[PDB]
Symmetry: D3
Subunit: 148 residues, 6 copies
Amino acid sequence: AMRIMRPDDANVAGNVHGGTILKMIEEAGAIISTRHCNSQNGERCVAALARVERTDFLSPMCIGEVAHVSAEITYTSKHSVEVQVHVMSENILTGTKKLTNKATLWYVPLSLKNVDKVLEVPPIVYLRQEQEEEGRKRYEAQKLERME
Amino acid sequence: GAMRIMRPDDANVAGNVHGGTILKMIEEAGAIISTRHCNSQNGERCVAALARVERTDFLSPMCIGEVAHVSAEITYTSKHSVEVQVHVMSENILTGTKKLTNKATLWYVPLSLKNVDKVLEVPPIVYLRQEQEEEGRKRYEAQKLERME
Amino acid sequence: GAMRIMRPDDANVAGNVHGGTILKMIEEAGAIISTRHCNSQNGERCVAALARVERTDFLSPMCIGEVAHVSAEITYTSKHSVEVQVHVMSENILTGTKKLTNKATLWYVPLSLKNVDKVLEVPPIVYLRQEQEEEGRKRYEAQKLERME
Amino acid sequence: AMRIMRPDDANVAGNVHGGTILKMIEEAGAIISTRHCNSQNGERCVAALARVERTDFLSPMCIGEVAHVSAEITYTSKHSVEVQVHVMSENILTGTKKLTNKATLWYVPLSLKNVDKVLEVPPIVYLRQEQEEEGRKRYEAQKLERME
Amino acid sequence: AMRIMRPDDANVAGNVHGGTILKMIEEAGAIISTRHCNSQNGERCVAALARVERTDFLSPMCIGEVAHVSAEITYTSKHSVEVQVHVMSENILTGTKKLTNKATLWYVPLSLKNVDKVLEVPPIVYLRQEQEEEGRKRYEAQKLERME
Amino acid sequence: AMRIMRPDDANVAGNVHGGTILKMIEEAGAIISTRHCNSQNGERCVAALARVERTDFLSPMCIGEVAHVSAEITYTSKHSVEVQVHVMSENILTGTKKLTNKATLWYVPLSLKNVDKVLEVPPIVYLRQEQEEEGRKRYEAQKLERME
Ligand SMILES: CC(C)(COP(=O)(O)OP(=O)(O)OC[C@H]1O[C@@H](n2cnc3c(N)ncnc32)[C@H](O)[C@@H]1OP(=O)(O)O)[C@@H](O)C(=O)NCCC(=O)NCCS
Ligand SMILES: CC(C)(COP(=O)(O)OP(=O)(O)OC[C@H]1O[C@@H](n2cnc3c(N)ncnc32)[C@H](O)[C@@H]1OP(=O)(O)O)[C@@H](O)C(=O)NCCC(=O)NCCS
Ligand SMILES: CC(C)(COP(=O)(O)OP(=O)(O)OC[C@H]1O[C@@H](n2cnc3c(N)ncnc32)[C@H](O)[C@@H]1OP(=O)(O)O)[C@@H](O)C(=O)NCCC(=O)NCCS
Ligand SMILES: CC(C)(COP(=O)(O)OP(=O)(O)OC[C@H]1O[C@@H](n2cnc3c(N)ncnc32)[C@H](O)[C@@H]1OP(=O)(O)O)[C@@H](O)C(=O)NCCC(=O)NCCS
Ligand SMILES: CC(C)(COP(=O)(O)OP(=O)(O)OC[C@H]1O[C@@H](n2cnc3c(N)ncnc32)[C@H](O)[C@@H]1OP(=O)(O)O)[C@@H](O)C(=O)NCCC(=O)NCCS
Ligand SMILES: CC(C)(COP(=O)(O)OP(=O)(O)OC[C@H]1O[C@@H](n2cnc3c(N)ncnc32)[C@H](O)[C@@H]1OP(=O)(O)O)[C@@H](O)C(=O)NCCC(=O)NCCS
């Protein structure tokens, strides 16, 4: 995703609201996860946001700057999808680019015809085994935590 | 607090509200409460910027036509930061049914309006129970440590 | 209630909020409170439609960056209509200053979702004092009579 | 003004919210009043909404219908402008047009340089003599009402 | 159509984005073409934008100025509608009016019930036979550009 | 640049309005052109839209489908930028993709210090020589159309 930041995206200091960026982040996560969950022509479904991991906002973004939002599916469990989203600001006058934040989201597919039906998530192929292993450990961390 | 009716543009094709919609509302509540507090002792004029979102689980869906209720509370202050806990509740105004959608914790930092990116001191808060100050102090130390990776 | 920070698109070239912006927020509060009430006894599912806005004066300006606080109360019910009083207060979160922006009164009529333009019976509200019902009944009669010129 | 009504303009029933129409009405009033209060090259100003008269909503408007919003300055006092706004719905499939609402609004011009400075309003030309007298009577009745 | 230009319509300097005006232009074209294609109570339809002809932006528009959009159906073929749209900027503080844009659009009526069914366009009334001839030439010109 | 199509982007049939797409195309054109015109760190400028030409809408896009907007600078004259934009629709439930739109936009860099000052456009490198010649022919034809 690429969008010019507008006055209504920003506070009175002209700096973009956290909420504006969070919204864009989730939009990217929703597209990528829904596409994936339908990618093997299983039951028609839409991915629902189940969890947002801790995220830190490192640098401001200003009106007139371009928000760049990119997403990657980094893990899949039996019924869930982990998405990592990166947000970068670009000033197209000066050329300066800054990392706004990195967020991690967990999605769960729900049947279009039965909203209470959690679907199985198709596997992804990992470029690196360490990526599957790291993803598994993150999956475990949140599973264990939610087990109270 | 804050409430608003969920509209078509707030929801997916299933009729369920996008997480991003609720996240935006949560941050709107945090911004108001933290900005007010950071100017509450008439210090240098400032606006609270969102520094951190803690992990948060979405427990129940919300649908078009349901009312999102968003409430915020300042639960800790450090020298230069504000911790805010936000609760989101969905209300179906046809059936009456209310459900807890989400609980989220946020951290804000006040930045001067006049001095670009100047971090300001946060006025102290008073704790209903002193157990709460200690718990908040522990939460503060935990994020301070986690960020210094 | 409802609260929202005023944004540049809410305001004219001078930074002052448009009447239309506030009118919209007023009606949003009215729509929620009246719809909830009209479904509160689980009658035929319905949505409250705005029938009337009483005369209303805008007492003080609001500015970009101030927080609009909107609060509503059902003050009367007739057989098929709901009277709602709405208060709008501005809050400057930098200075702490609060001002009454506007008081408005609205009338809603519940319409069936299933049966188009079917007007439904409104559940009675509880009054703390008989005087409240009498005062509302007088306002109801006034507008009812006027709608015959 | 003429605008197609969209889903976000309407409730779950597909009927346009009163609030949406109210916002459009005020937009029409703001334009006509601001243009008028600058029409004699006085101090630059913007008209602010002072009063909305009682108004009844007669017929619903639906998603996909076209809202027609028309305004006319019907009276001016020394420092205020009376505006009548009509809203009509047009169904462009069926051809059917309906009167949604008629509203009267009062605006007061405020200096751009000084928000607290109320400016004098230029006179309007009345097509009929009786119209000025009618507007004058309404002005005095509301001015006398505002006592508290 | 008339609308005041707002901060979100414009860049950091306060000049209106072309996209904002393009959106307004298309809205006007969609209304006028849809009404016409349903004017004889044929199968219920909505006119879809098929083409924008070479449109030129002649002068900037600013926040606070009023955009005036006017549309006219200038030619009809068997299954399409040519619409010419004019955009005028009005500064309501100074009184200045400027021609912002002239655009020519082509619409095709599609059945509402029957997803992608192209319908016949009712013929338009011409004031002079010369107008039909000129329209025909423009019709043939766009046909040629499209066949390359 | 991706985004999901929402109810307010579309008509009563669920099909996206031409205006919605035109706005997205222009946003992409504005970003790429402004970035390019500041790429050699000349006088700070923003590129203003001057022309939209010969843009055709080939297939409908629906609510819930994802719009993919891709921009490319295809010609530069001394003071203007030609941008070609393609819009592709993607159904993330079915996987189906369709070419929605092909557009051509001309931008002109205007100094931020002097809003009437048309700046020089840095040259671009052409992947195939033939593209420059084709671009020049298009450029000459439109520049002469603004003469004859
Ligand atoms: C918030 C910000 C100003 C902090 O910058 P910094 O270099 O860390 O500033 P300092 O080192 O002086 O620290 C100031 C305070 O901020 C706190 N802080 C900084 N980052 C934090 C984070 N991610 N989470 C919680 N607190 C944080 C520090 O703990 C410190 O408070 P303390 O002294 O009471 O412990 C900076 O990270 C920033 O501008 N981020 C972007 C904010 C923003 O624009 N958000 C929306 C983006 S769309
Ligand atoms: C996501 C949701 C459907 C899960 O419900 P549930 O009763 O826990 O479902 P299950 O017990 O069958 O678990 C299904 C999967 O979801 C995962 N899950 C559930 N809650 C989760 C959370 N908070 N974070 C990460 N994963 C979660 C489970 O781990 C399981 O996947 P796995 O078997 O691969 O490990 C439910 O919490 C929900 O509807 N949440 C709201 C979603 C939404 O609408 N979001 C937007 C709100 S605005
Ligand atoms: C409108 C406003 C400037 C009037 O303030 P005031 O103290 O009464 O000012 P003045 O006494 O000098 O009156 C100026 C004119 O306004 C008129 N007026 C004041 N309140 C009015 C009302 N509510 N309805 C109609 N006219 C009104 C007066 O009659 C006078 O006109 P006149 O001399 O021709 O009779 C003030 O109430 C205000 O700023 N309101 C908020 C306007 C606004 O921002 N609207 C949008 C809110 S979101
Ligand atoms: C409100 C509406 C349904 C009433 O229609 P109606 O033909 O008068 O219906 P009824 O005669 O059966 O009257 C039903 C109730 O509505 C009330 N009513 C009707 N118009 C009213 C008005 N303008 N103000 C207050 N009450 C009104 C009647 O008093 C009656 O209540 P009661 O029996 O307790 O006295 C109708 O005027 C309408 O559909 N208006 C448009 C509503 C709308 O869509 N609003 C937004 C427009 S953008
Ligand atoms: C585009 C604009 C700057 C050109 O004005 P002008 O008086 O013709 O300026 P010039 O004669 O000096 O022409 C400068 C360049 O613009 C080009 N140009 C002007 N109009 C053009 C058009 N409609 N299409 C393509 N190129 C155009 C010229 O070809 C020239 O480039 P070149 O020297 O490489 O050939 C002017 O018409 C303008 O400000 N338009 C409005 C732009 C805007 O605000 N867009 C959004 C409106 S909502
Ligand atoms: C408009 C559309 C239905 C035409 O499809 P088609 O296969 O060419 O249909 P037909 O061959 O039956 O042609 C019907 C008419 O459309 C016209 N037409 C099609 N594309 C056109 C274009 N690019 N410019 C002008 N006219 C066009 C033809 O000239 C023909 O008119 P005629 O018979 O009077 O000469 C198709 O291109 C489409 O669905 N485009 C997208 C429309 C849309 O959804 N717009 C918004 C996109 S966000």
